[PDB]
Scaffold this motif. Structure first.
Motif, PDB file in Angstrom:
ATOM      1  N   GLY A 142       0.817  -1.209   0.000  1.00 57.81           N
ATOM      2  CA  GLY A 142       0.000   0.000   0.000  1.00 57.81           C
ATOM      3  C   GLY A 142       0.851   1.259   0.000  1.00 57.81           C
ATOM      4  N   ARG A 143       2.177   1.102   0.110  1.00 58.15           N
ATOM      5  CA  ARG A 143       3.101   2.228   0.065  1.00 58.15           C
ATOM      6  C   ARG A 143       2.893   2.874  -1.286  1.00 58.15           C
ATOM      7  N   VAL A 144       2.834   4.192  -1.296  1.00 58.09           N
ATOM      8  CA  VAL A 144       2.661   4.935  -2.528  1.00 58.09           C
ATOM      9  C   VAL A 144       3.829   5.880  -2.715  1.00 58.09           C
ATOM     10  N   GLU A 145       4.253   5.996  -3.954  1.00 53.35           N
ATOM     11  CA  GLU A 145       5.382   6.806  -4.350  1.00 53.35           C
ATOM     12  C   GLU A 145       4.968   7.852  -5.403  1.00 53.35           C
ATOM     13  N   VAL A 146       5.228   9.130  -5.130  1.00 49.76           N
ATOM     14  CA  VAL A 146       4.891  10.207  -6.055  1.00 49.76           C
ATOM     15  C   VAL A 146       6.167  10.810  -6.649  1.00 49.76           C
ATOM     16  N   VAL A 147       6.245  10.913  -7.956  1.00 49.94           N
ATOM     17  CA  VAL A 147       7.427  11.466  -8.589  1.00 49.94           C
ATOM     18  C   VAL A 147       7.056  12.713  -9.342  1.00 49.94           C
ATOM     19  N   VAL A 148       7.860  13.759  -9.157  1.00 50.05           N
ATOM     20  CA  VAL A 148       7.628  15.015  -9.805  1.00 50.05           C
ATOM     21  C   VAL A 148       8.900  15.738 -10.261  1.00 50.05           C
ATOM     22  N   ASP A 162      -2.758   9.462   1.936  1.00 43.64           N
ATOM     23  CA  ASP A 162      -1.788  10.439   2.468  1.00 43.64           C
ATOM     24  C   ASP A 162      -1.140  11.252   1.364  1.00 43.64           C
ATOM     25  N   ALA A 163      -0.885  10.619   0.228  1.00 40.82           N
ATOM     26  CA  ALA A 163      -0.317  11.314  -0.906  1.00 40.82           C
ATOM     27  C   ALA A 163      -1.337  12.336  -1.365  1.00 40.82           C
ATOM     28  N   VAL A 164      -2.604  11.927  -1.489  1.00 43.07           N
ATOM     29  CA  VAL A 164      -3.649  12.849  -1.893  1.00 43.07           C
ATOM     30  C   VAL A 164      -3.729  13.988  -0.901  1.00 43.07           C
ATOM     31  N   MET A 165      -3.569  13.710   0.383  1.00 43.84           N
ATOM     32  CA  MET A 165      -3.610  14.792   1.389  1.00 43.84           C
ATOM     33  C   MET A 165      -2.448  15.814   1.217  1.00 43.84           C
ATOM     34  N   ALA A 166      -1.348  15.384   0.612  1.00 44.92           N
ATOM     35  CA  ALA A 166      -0.216  16.261   0.364  1.00 44.92           C
ATOM     36  C   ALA A 166      -0.396  17.107  -0.898  1.00 44.92           C
ATOM     37  N   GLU A 224      12.117  14.120  -8.591  1.00 49.65           N
ATOM     38  CA  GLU A 224      12.240  13.915  -7.154  1.00 49.65           C
ATOM     39  C   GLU A 224      11.114  12.942  -6.769  1.00 49.65           C
ATOM     40  N   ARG A 225      11.399  12.052  -5.822  1.00 54.20           N
ATOM     41  CA  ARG A 225      10.435  11.049  -5.379  1.00 54.20           C
ATOM     42  C   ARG A 225      10.046  11.270  -3.925  1.00 54.20           C
ATOM     43  N   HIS A 226       8.766  11.191  -3.652  1.00 56.45           N
ATOM     44  CA  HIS A 226       8.281  11.366  -2.304  1.00 56.45           C
ATOM     45  C   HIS A 226       7.423  10.169  -1.979  1.00 56.45           C
ATOM     46  N   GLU A 227       7.649   9.548  -0.834  1.00 59.72           N
ATOM     47  CA  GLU A 227       6.946   8.333  -0.448  1.00 59.72           C
ATOM     48  C   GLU A 227       5.914   8.619   0.629  1.00 59.72           C
ATOM     49  N   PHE A 228       4.822   7.853   0.618  1.00 60.47           N
ATOM     50  CA  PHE A 228       3.728   8.022   1.571  1.00 60.47           C
ATOM     51  C   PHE A 228       3.215   6.641   2.003  1.00 60.47           C
ATOM     52  N   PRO A 229       2.761   6.515   3.255  1.00 59.66           N
ATOM     53  CA  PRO A 229       2.185   5.256   3.745  1.00 59.66           C
ATOM     54  C   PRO A 229       0.987   4.781   2.973  1.00 59.66           C
ATOM     55  N   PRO A 270      -7.235  11.414  13.617  1.00 58.73           N
ATOM     56  CA  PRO A 270      -6.629  12.649  14.149  1.00 58.73           C
ATOM     57  C   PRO A 270      -5.860  13.506  13.131  1.00 58.73           C
ATOM     58  N   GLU A 271      -5.236  12.875  12.153  1.00 58.17           N
ATOM     59  CA  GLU A 271      -4.495  13.572  11.121  1.00 58.17           C
ATOM     60  C   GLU A 271      -5.414  14.519  10.343  1.00 58.17           C
ATOM     61  N   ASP A 272      -6.679  14.119  10.151  1.00 53.58           N
ATOM     62  CA  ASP A 272      -7.640  14.937   9.405  1.00 53.58           C
ATOM     63  C   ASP A 272      -7.955  16.224  10.119  1.00 53.58           C
TER      64      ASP A 272
END
Lengths: 509, 528
Positions: free
Chosen positions: A22-28, A317-321, A308-313, A391-393
Motif C-alpha cells: 500500500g506504500r505509494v510513491e509520487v514522482v515530480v 496520504d499522498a492525496v492529502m499532500a 524527485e520522489r516522495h513516499e507516503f504510507p 486525528p491527522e484529518d
C-alpha cells in the motif's frame, strides 16, 4: 512489483505508483518559475533582456508571480513587474546608459544621513518592521525615478486597456492623472492581470557601522511609489499550496552574474549570466543579451529534467499532500482506482464543509464586523469536526483554516484565540500561533541578529552566541521558546544596542 | 438721523442701521466659544474642572467644536474631546495623582532628540511636521492607558445614546473597533463630532528642543489621523527640554485658558485662572493638596471663567458698509436667516435677500450636476448639465464683486464636489466664476504653505538660543511678507531673500545638518 496509477501528468510530470503493502510513491519535476530574483548591478544589467527573451519565448514569463530586484536590479524588476514584455524591455534597456544615470538630492541625503538613521532605528523602545518604513516617511515623493515611473504607467495602462472590477479602474484613473504605481497597486493588479507582477525591492546598506537589510514591498510599504523605492535601493551599495507538504514547493529563478534543502534548492535554482567569451555598442549589447538568453534557456531546460520522489504510507496520504490544482490534474486517472476515488470524495466533502464555514462567516459579517459564533457557524464547526476520519484529518483541516489570504478564516481564528471546543478550531488556533512565532523569529533574525553578527570587528564569543540564537529561533513554536532565546542574548551578549533590541522584541505575554 | 432696520437679533445681538447716504452699519457681539485652548501644566491642571463647570452651567460647552491642549494640557484636552462632562471630569481630576504618573517612551525622547532634529530639518523634500516621524517611530504606560480607557468608555456611552434608528456605518464601525480594545484616534474624533455634538475634534500640541532648536509638535486629524490620542498626549507631555473667511462678521471665538491684529483678539479671548487667594497661594503648582483645596481652586476658576464668559457677551463691534447689499454679502447663511424677516420689509433688503436665494439655488444646481457626473465616473469632466450650471452661476452676477463672491463659495471648506470641480478647473473652457474660484483656491493654498513654512522652518531658527539679531530681524520680516503672499512668485521671493541674507556659524563638529535654514528655504520653493 509496483503498479503505475498515473504517469507524467502535467507540467510537473506527476506520477504515482503503488506497491503491494500500500506504500505509494509520487514522482515530480520542478514547477516552472514563480519567483524571478534579480541580484542586480548597473553595467551588468544590460544582460537582463536576454533573460526575459528566454522566459517569454518558453511561455514561462506568464506564470512568474513575483519579481524581486536587488540593488541596481530594482529598476529592471520594477519595469518587469509592470508588465513590460521582452521586446519593449530590450528596446528600453538599450537606450538607457544607466551607469551614468545613477549619480541627485535623495541619494545625496542618504550618504549624509546614514549614521543618524542607524542610531535612531536601533535605539527604539519598540521594534519597527524594517528601516524601509523610516525611509518611506522621510523620503516621500529626478531622471531615473521618472523614466521608471512613466514607463510603468504606460505599460500598466496599456495592459488595463487590453482587459473591469472597480478596484482596477480606480488604479487606472489615479495613474492617468499622473500618479505613479505603488506596491499595493501591483499586488491588486496582479490578481486580475497575469502580465503584471507583485514586486519586492531589496538592498543592503551601512548605517552607523552595521549592515541593514532594506525591503520594500506590498506588506511593509504598500503605498510607496515603486520608482522612489528603486532609486533608494540603488543608492545603498555606495554606503560602504500546502506549506507542510513536500509536493507544495515553489520554483525560483535567481539571476546572478559571473532545513538546508533550501540552501541547495537556492543554488539549483540559480543561473549565472556569463560576462566573458570569444563603452557599449548595439552589437555588443545584442551579443551579451544573446549569451544570457542561451544560458537561461539552458537552465530552464535542465530544470525540466530533474525528478524527485516522495513516499507516503498510503494513496490517501499522498492525496492529502496535494493542493487543489495538483489534485485536479490527476483526478480523472485516480477516479479509475477505488482507493483513489474514495480519496477524491473525502477532498470533495472537505471542500464543501470549508465552503459552508466560509459562508457562515460571510453571513455573520452582514450584520456586524465584530464576529461571534452564530448558530449557523457553530453548526459548520460541528460538521467540520465530523468529517475527520482520524486525528491527522483534524490537523489537516486546521491548516486549511490558516490558508494565507483567507480573510474570513482569519477573523474566525482571532475569535478562536480567546477561548469552547471545536476540535478543528483549537487545532487551527495552535497552528496560527506557531506560524506567528515563526514569522517573528525571521524578523528578529533579519533585523537584530544580522546586523550584530555581520558587524565588522564582532568578537568570536558573540558570533557563537548569535549563531546559536539563530538555530534555536528556527526551532521556536511558542512565545516562551522565543523569549528564552532573547533572555539569553540579554544575559550573555558582551558589551548594548543588541541587548536593548533583544529586550524590546520580547513578546509581552 | 440713522434708521434702525434690525435690533439685537440673536446670540450675536445683531443690529443694522442705515444713514441717509445709504451707508449701512452692522453691530455685533462675539459668538460663544467654538475653540477651547488649554495651555497646560500638570499640577496647575487641577483648576481645569471649574473651567468646565463654568462652560456647561452656561450651556456653552455644547457649541465648543475643537479642543486644543498644549504640553501637559493634552491629557485634559483628550478627556474633554471625548465627551466627558464636568462632573465626571472633576471626579477623575481629583483622583489622578499626576506627579507619579507624569517610562521608556519618554526616556527615548530625551536621548533621541538630537538625531530627530537633524533628520527632519534636513529632508530634500519637506514633510508635514515632526509628529509624522514620531507617529511611525513610536507606535503603540499608566497615563496613556487611563486616558485611553476613559475616552473609550465616554465615547461608547455617547455613541449608545444615539437613536437606535439609523446610525451611520461610519460611527458603528468606530464603536466596534473600540469595543474590542482599540483606542480612539484623531480621525475617529473628527468623524464622531459630525454626528455627536458632545464629542470634539482634538489638537494636541507641544514644543520640544531638538538639536538646539525648538520644534512645534502637532498631532491632529489632518497630520496624524490614525494616531492614538493617548499616545499623542503622552508624547506631548514629555517633550525634551460654516462661515465666511473674507467677511469681518464671520469670526470665530476662542476661549484660551492660561494660569496666573488677531493678537488682541487672542488676548481678549484669553482667561487667566487665578492661583492665589485668601484660601491659599498655589502658584508653586508652576505638595499634596487636600480635597478642600482642590475644591476651592476649582471654584475660583469657575467664577473667573463665568466672569469672563459674561463680559464677552457685553462687547460690541461696529462694521460699516457702503450699502445694505454689501452688509448682506458679508453674512453667512445662518446670520442672514436670523434677520431675513426684518430685512424683507425693506426694498433694498429684499433685493439683497433675493440675490442670496438665487445664489443658494444655482450653487445647489452645481453641486447636483457634480453628483450626477460622479454616478457615471469618478474622474470628473464638464458634462453638458455642468456647463449649464456654470453658465447659470455666471449670469447670476450683477457686478464684478458677485463673481468673486461666488468663487469664494465654491471654495467652501468641506465641500467635496466643489473641490473636484476646482481641480478640473486648475487644468484650463471659460466660466468666469470658475476661473475666479480657481485663483481663490491657489491664493488659499499659498496662504497655507506660508503658515507651514513659518511653523516648520522659521519658528526653529527664530527662537534658536543665540541667533544673531540681524537674522531675527530677517526672519521676522519674512513672516509679515509671507502673511501677505498670494502667489508662488511672492512666496518664492521671500524664500530667495532668506537664501540670500540668512547667515549661519561654521560648526564642523555639529555633525551633519548645522544650518538647515538656507537649505530648507531652497527645498520649499514652489516648482513653477
Amino acid at each position: 512489483a509496483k503498479v503505475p496509477l498515473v504517469k507524467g501528468v502535467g507540467e510537473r510530470n506527476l506520477s504515482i505508483y503503488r506497491h503491494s503493502d500500500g506504500r505509494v510513491e509520487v514522482v515530480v519535476s520542478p514547477p516552472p518559475p514563480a519567483h524571478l530574483v534579480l541580484s542586480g548591478g548597473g553595467a551588468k544589467g544590460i544582460a537582463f533582456p536576454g533573460m526575459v527573451q528566454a522566459l517569454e519565448e518558453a511561455d514561462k514569463l506568464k506564470g512568474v508571480k513575483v519579481v524581486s530586484g536587488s540593488s541596481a536590479g530594482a529598476i529592471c524588476a520594477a519595469l518587469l513587474a509592470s508588465g513590460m514584455d521582452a521586446k519593449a524591455f530590450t528596446q528600453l534597456s538599450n537606450n538607457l546608459d544607466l551607469p551614468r544615470l545613477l549619480n541627485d538630492p535623495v541619494t545625496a541625503w542618504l550618504q549624509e544621513a546614514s549614521s543618524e538613521l542607524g542610531k535612531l532605528v536601533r535605539s527604539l523602545p519598540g521594534p519597527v518592521g524594517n528601516i524601509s518604513q523610516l525611509l518611506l516617511t522621510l523620503l516621500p515623493r529626478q531622471p531615473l525615478e521618472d523614466l521608471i515611473r512613466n514607463e510603468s504607467r504606460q505599460s500598466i495602462l496599456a495592459h488595463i486597456a487590453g482587459m473591469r472590477p472597480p478596484e482596477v479602474t480606480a488604479i487606472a484613473e489615479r495613474l492617468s492623472a499622473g500618479g505613479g504605481a505603488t506596491f499595493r497597486d501591483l499586488e491588486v493588479l496582479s490578481r486580475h492581470i497575469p502580465a503584471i507582477k507583485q514586486l519586492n525591492i531589496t538592498g543592503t546598506g551601512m548605517f552607523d557601522g552595521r549592515p541593514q537589510l532594506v525591503v520594500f514591498n506590498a506588506n511593509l510599504t504598500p503605498d510607496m511609489d515603486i520608482g522612489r523605492a528603486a532609486l533608494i535601493s540603488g543608492a545603498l551599495p555606495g554606503l560602504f499550496s500546502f506549506p507542510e507538504s513536500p509536493l507544495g514547493k515553489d520554483e525560483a529563478l535567481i539571476v546572478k552574474f559571473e532545513q538546508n534543502d533550501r540552501l541547495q534548492a537556492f543554488s539549483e535554482q540559480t543561473v549565472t549570466l556569463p560576462l566573458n567569451s570569444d563603452t557599449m555598442t548595439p552589437e555588443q549589447k545584442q551579443h551579451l543579451q544573446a549569451q544570457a538568453r542561451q544560458t537561461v534557456s539552458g537552465h530552464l531546460q535542465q530544470r525540466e529534467l530533474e525528478r524527485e520522489r516522495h513516499e507516503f504510507p498510503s494513496l490517501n496520504d499522498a492525496v492529502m499532500a496535494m493542493d487543489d490544482q495538483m489534485l485536479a490534474s490527476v483526478q480523472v486517472d485516480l477516479q479509475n482506482d477505488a482507493a483513489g476515488a474514495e480519496a477524491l470524495r473525502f477532498r470533495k466533502d472537505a471542500q464543501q464543509a470549508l465552503q459552508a464555514l466560509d459562508t457562515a462567516i460571510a453571513e455573520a459579517n452582514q450584520t456586524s464586523t465584530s464576529l461571534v459564533i452564530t448558530p449557523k457557524l457553530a453548526s459548520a464547526l460541528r460538521n467540520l469536526d465530523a468529517l475527520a476520519r482520524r486525528p491527522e484529518d483534524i490537523e489537516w483541516l486546521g491548516k486549511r483554516l490558516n490558508a494565507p489570504g483567507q480573510r474570513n478564516f482569519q477573523q474566525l481564528l482571532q475569535v478562536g484565540t480567546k477561548q469552547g471546543l471545536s476540535k478543528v478550531l483549537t487545532s487551527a488556533v495552535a497552528e496560527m500561533q506557531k506560524r506567528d512565532i515563526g514569522v517573528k523569529a525571521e524578523n528578529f533574525i533579519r533585523e537584530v541578529i544580522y546586523p550584530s553578527l555581520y558587524r565588522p570587528g564582532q568578537p568570536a564569543a558573540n558570533v557563537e552566541l548569535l549563531q546559536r540564537a539563530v538555530r534555536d529561533l528556527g526551532e521556536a513554536t511558542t512565545p516562551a521558546e522565543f523569549n528564552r532565546v532573547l533572555d539569553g542574548i540579554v544575559k550573555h551578549y558582551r558589551a548594548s544596542t543588541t541587548v536593548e533590541q533583544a529586550k524590546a522584541w520580547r513578546i509581552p505575554v
